[PDB]
């Protein structure tokens, strides 16, 4: 309606000072985002000046005995581009009422690495690459699957244009530019090789907040995939039979490689990378995470074993 | 029909400075709203300024008896989202022509408790929570229920986002701001267990006006499903078959409480209510009533009764 | 399409002096508003200063004879709530191209009975209640209205809220801002006892004014149901069967009531009425009634 | 809905100086267009200050061996009309990591040509003409088309109005003027013979610039058919059957041409173009047409 | 579709000599007809002769579940209206294993009132009167509800005829042949005031079989709305509002009357023309036979 | 449509003294039967006396091997109802082209334990009892599912009535009277408690005729649902949620347990069942019986407690049970088994 949309547009720095703060966090399948809105005195920048929360985690799959109170600590501010103004999102990591993280929460053992003074003073980078597909909400086929199925690698959807060969891309534009306002580094969007498919990059983006980042634009994403009436899956494989998906790509450089001085540097660190069990090179890729996987422990895990391990 | 929107938000302020008072009141059930509207000469900020109205309650299930007129006090100013610039909402409560209370306006007595000097030196705020559930117009289930019916307690819906687990969040997100810009105390919203089901909480808020605030906030929360060609429902058991729905729990602080000691005079607390028969505890929990009741009730037996 | 928007919300104050005036009468059935609009050099608000015009009275049963002209006076002005800008709407009332008025010109007797010197001094006030009914264009039954038909006198539409109780508010809010925007002396709304049934009241509203007035009223409300896409009525019984219709209780005073005391001046216009602060009294045409009112509390000689 | 295009319509200005650049390639089948977009930390008015990118050649049929990677150089620059704003379209052409040019890369050898000194120094000017027609989606048939069949060089449709007559209108002006606003040199547009069919011109454009500025007002047109949910064609037999196209036809001038102007300047060159086989030349690259036009009456020798 | 209505309308009688046999019971509520269906060797036509049968009452709100099983006794034979041929319908009542009637038996006492022989001597006839209404599958409202709703007593529709007035006459007329032919004693049929509103008439039928013949001819007429697509209700209130319904009028006579009314009118007044059919009779004949002032 | 139908129905006897038969088998999975006809020289009534035929068995999950070829072995013959005249169904059994039934066909051993004479003198009877589901094509819910969802197991479906209650009718009446006419021993028919779902009994039936007129049974059902349009399903849970679904309950007797004396006889068979339970579970928690008790893995009935003779009910196959591995189990285990 255009009476409904102007009460959601409404500024609110017109008729006080409160503001509207969106918490946010991971669910109990690692892949769930959940939210809720609580308001606040004023605006706010720093995550530190933020109240604590909490809510039911017997009812997202994260408290399942007699305690099902689960505490919610603010980490990262982005901007709001659903609520506009001096509104807010807030990305939280989820503990127990005693102060112990769950199982669920990845964020905690990534920001432990990252404020290793070794790795902090390494300015890892890092570059996501997401793929995703949006998907009919009734059938949960890919939107512009064509009457006949799979179309196969070599098509004309890949970066194209027209209404017979881009799906969503209204989705897609309006997410780009969202992130932008948010405060997200994106870097970049394209259409990939199936209908209704496509991907965004973000990066460079420092440590631990690479993470904060990329689950605020799957969040700003999903929530925008909402509004359209459309769904979301950045499952690697969301329908079956034959089907085209990238992955999770990761580029990742330290402060020594990107001062040259150390191209060697960029080599012993794949060099460690194949010492654990894919890797390619400025910086380097990872080709071994799939669209799914939680981005803390993707992005934490390529620090650690180049900085930190020793076999 | 882009005419029509283009005149239903025409700014009057461009005219002359006459305002749109939208006079609110407490049907005859206890839980229906009813408004109508008047102009008034000029901006309002202080209800005992406004004048008294009145409607025909042999409309609304308040007057049987001979004299079908009932009359409407002003108690709380509002700010009206829906009309903008000056123009205000006005909860009031009903009376006869005599001067008395209706049976169905609770505020009176309520006003009354919170007026005593025992009570009002303590201060009592209120945390209401307000569940409910939207509901499809012409089938009457909630707005993205499953085919195969009762999802259970554990589901995507709770505080979920997408198109398929978030419904109706135009509806919520419109209401949050509306009762912001209103002068509402909202303090959040969450999406609850079921589909289409959701929870805005208000206050901290001083004494009557917790009632007050959370009768507008309904108001405006219907107005806007009435926009949205949607049903909405406050009942804790909204459709036939399993639901889980919460109820509207009520926390509830002295000055007391909020300083020095607070344990004390909590756990007392919490004992006379106890004494009088659902109460857990900063302050302390209680749990489709009206409000003015439950607030009122909650400071009285704590403050102002004695076994 | 929002192509077609834009031309209609053109703000001609941009681009010239020129004004449109939409020209508006009572035809021949006594209820059916009709109108038309013209061009003219710029701003006016004084309605003696408008031309006259005319249209042709055995197209709106209005001119039988073999002289089918009927012409147009000037008599009131509003602000144009649709063209907006300085573009303006003009109630006129209907005259034989010799001069005399229409036996469907109710105003002209009302206006005499307002321009008596007796009545003018005293400087009747008016409150109009105009209640009415929207009708789906299709079946011609209320909006909203229930599959199992007339739900009785005692339900939840008056003064209702809500997707199953109020039907049609967008177009009572519309018309009320339009109605103040004009410059009418809208003075309240609500939602009433059937479902699509609504009532809007008008004043205080001075002598002649009254009539002007309600009759601009109900052409902006006809011109918004027209938008919307939906048929209005204002008779009293809308529709078959059973059916509650409060009325039009127009209110009055004159100068005389207002002042100290009055209260005798009340006591005495009641009689009169009967016979033949302010007082009420119990589809009709507004320059009717209004006038009645005036002639019989200060004219008439028992 | 309305929600969403706030979100496409953001103004980034207002949140920092970074602005989207969309990197526009020609694909694989020598009429596809491809595109994507990356953010770059400030604005660019120089292509040669933009960085080069790459893609993956194996899905637009433009890289089959074990490196399927292909290099985009960026070689002109437009104002992005969807995007607004600071943010901008980027004219690419393709190449393999090696180095080399692709063989559906005809701008290379095009810019050797208007950069060799006997071409540069005349400055040659071209005249594009480009016919398309729109389609339904589902039916692939022009928008328009009658129950019936093929109607004819005899219509309605050429340079016609009215819902019956001129079809995809919203289309055509809403290209046009984004055309404009992204600096491309549209200078008209026409209906044509077909219903839903219709062409733009382009030009005077200078040397290679006009083969970038067409492939950009291709991309823009179908960008906005995209959004229209409608296909375009700029095949010269876009369905079976009988059917009326004109082509690509090419303006040519000189600045020989231009100045005195001698007429005789254009004699040769049209006598040249003869041997191998202003004034016009009768979906093909205009990079190809408007360079080999160049070569042949600039470099060429008989 | 042909292909199924063809496997339908087989003629068993061409391949053997079994039947089918429909057994028909009142469910818990009281109003709620149930059925179901087992092969016999042979054409029956003495009720007596069939084997007893039983169902889950846990199932029909008649039994609990830790010890559901409920007994049918065969107490009525017609000819099946829709398997046709030798197949037949029968009329049963319910008791537990132990040999006690179900609270919701009605038949059981109305049977012992009519086997007494200050009754059955008496042969008393019964003429019943069932009103029914025709609902819209989807909206729950009558068949040809007008658009503006409750119309009044006074209308086009009753005993109407016209696309506009006489809503679902293809079920009452298939009710009507399907009733004969089943050996139901269906004495005649009306339109009613309403829209969507019929009224059958059975009779007269002799003492406990007047009960057997009206279940059965409910049945018959429930099928037939199955087949229809339509709802039906026998509520004298089938929908919220104004509604002009008859009532349950009952006809009634012995072999003394028919040969008097006035003590029999007498008697019923303290406690001619005068819920569950074998009730209403039984307690008429126990009224005006052997009741105790 | 009216002119597709009567070249369906043209009776082929006018015409000449072929017939057409429909062999059908039982596919890869277990559940899925298959069929395809052909035509024969003139009308057969002894299966013995039908030809083999074969299919692709990579095409039904039913040769992995190089050797695709799959042998069918008629077994069984009833009246075909949709063909009609002298045209017929015919059960088979499946083989490799060396002589082996495939690990599939379950009929084979079955054969076997009935054709033993211990089995054979003591003329087991079978009466099994086959649930399902009729399922809306488009949603995969079933026919008549309520906008809110599930309804309970206290409902007006079992057994019901009218349009609002009994969904499918049509397919169940066609299909009892087509299992009459092609010579299954079909006993009786019910609505079941939730909606569109139904059951239908055949019994008694002798021996390995019982898997055969079962199989025959659901050929027809599969049948007809396609005639209408509509999904049907023999699964425990065909959706998903609370449902009450039954299974295939077996009733059983031997010649003795039906005569006098009886029921010490089915007291005995009882026990040995028990002693085998987890044998049989696999196949088809903890054991036990009586005559009123759920959920009993075996069900005696108060009538032939009351005779002191009749038979008794295995209450633990589910819906989707080979009949054949069922009713052979239970002779095996009770005739020829020794502990």
């Not at 799906?167 to 932008?180: N, Q, S």
Request: charged letters at 20%; a negative charge; aromatic letters at 10%.
């Amino acid at each position: 309606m255009s009476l409904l949309s102007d009460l959601i547009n409404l500024n609110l720095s017109e008729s006080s000072e409160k503001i509207i703060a969106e918490y946010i966090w991971v669910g109990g399948s690692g892949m769930d985002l959940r939210s809720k809105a609580r308001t606040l005195p004023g605006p706010v920048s720093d995550p530190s000046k933020l109240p604590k929360w909490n809510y039911d985690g017997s009812s997202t799959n994260q408290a399942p005995g007699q305690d099902s109170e689960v505490i919610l600590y603010p980490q990262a501010i982005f901007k709001d581009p659903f609520r506009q103004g001096n509104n807010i999102l807030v990305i939280c990591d989820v503990y127990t009422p005693a102060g112990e993280p769950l199982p669920t929460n990845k964020r905690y053992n990534a920001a432990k690495i990252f404020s290793h003074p070794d790795v902090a003073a390494e300015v890892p980078w890092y570059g996501i690459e997401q793929e995703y597909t949006l998907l009919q909400k009734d059938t949960n086929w890919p939107l512009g699957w064509p009457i006949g199925g799979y179309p196969g690698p070599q098509g004309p959807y890949y970066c194209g244009i027209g209404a017979d060969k881009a799906y969503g891309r209204d989705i897609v534009d309006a997410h780009y530019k969202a992130c932008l306002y948010a405060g997200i580094n994106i870097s970049g969007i394209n259409g990939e090789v199936m209908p209704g498919q496509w991907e965004f990059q973000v990066g460079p983006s420092v440590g631990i907040s690479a993470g904060d980042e990329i689950w605020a634009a799957r969040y700003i994403l999903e929530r925008i995939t909402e509004i359209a009436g459309v769904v979301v899956s950045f499952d690697p494989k969301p329908i079956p039979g034959d089907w085209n998906g990238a992955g999770a790509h990761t580029n990742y450089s330290t402060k020594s490689m990107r001062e040259n001085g150390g191209y060697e540097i960029i080599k012993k660190a794949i060099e460690k990378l194949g010492l654990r069990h894919s890797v390619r090179v400025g910086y380097f890729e990872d080709r071994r995470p799939s669209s799914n996987m939680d981005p803390y422990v993707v992005t934490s895990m390529i620090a650690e074993t180049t900085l930190l391990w020793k076999p």
